[PDB]
C-alpha cells in the first residue's frame, strides 16, 4: 500500500496519524516553479498562494474510518490536477500544500 509505506517513511505516522496528505509525482524544480505562476488567494485569506497552469500527477492519502494512532492506515486515490501551494522566503519557495483543483 503506497500510502501506508510513504506516510510512514516520511514521518507522517510517528507523532500522530496525519489524517490527509498529498504526494506530488513531479520534480522538485517543477513544483518550485509554481511559485512564479498564477497568484491566487489561500483558503485562509492570505495572498501568497500560487496555482499551477498545468495538471500534475498527485496521490491523496487519507486515513480509513477505523484508523487510529499508532496503527495508522490509509486509502490511496490518484489524480491528475492543478496544485495550489503557499510560497514564502528568499528563495521564494513552497512552504504549504493548499489544495488540488
Amino acid at each position: 500500500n503506497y500510502c501506508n509505506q510513504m506516510m510512514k517513511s516520511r514521518n507522517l505516522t510517528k507523532d500522530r496519524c496525519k489524517p490527509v496528505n498529498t504526494f506530488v509525482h513531479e520534480s522538485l524544480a517543477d513544483v518550485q516553479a509554481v511559485c512564479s505562476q498564477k497568484n491566487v488567494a489561500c483558503k485562509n485569506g492570505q495572498t501568497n498562494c500560487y496555482q499551477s497552469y498545468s495538471t500534475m500527477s498527485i496521490t491523496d492519502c487519507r486515513e480509513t474510518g477505523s484508523s487510529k494512532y499508532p496503527n495508522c492506515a490509509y486509502k490511496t486515490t490518484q489524480a491528475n490536477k492543478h496544485i495550489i501551494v503557499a510560497c514564502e522566503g528568499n528563495p521564494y519557495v513552497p512552504v504549504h500544500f493548499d489544495a488540488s483543483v
Partner: peptide
C-alpha cells in the same frame, strides 16, 4: 528544526 521549505519537501515530494 526543519525549515518550512524542507518540511514541505519531506511531506509532499515524490520524484
Amino acid at each position: 528544526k526543519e525549515t518550512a521549505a524542507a518540511l514541505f519537501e519531506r511531506q509532499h515530494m515524490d520524484s
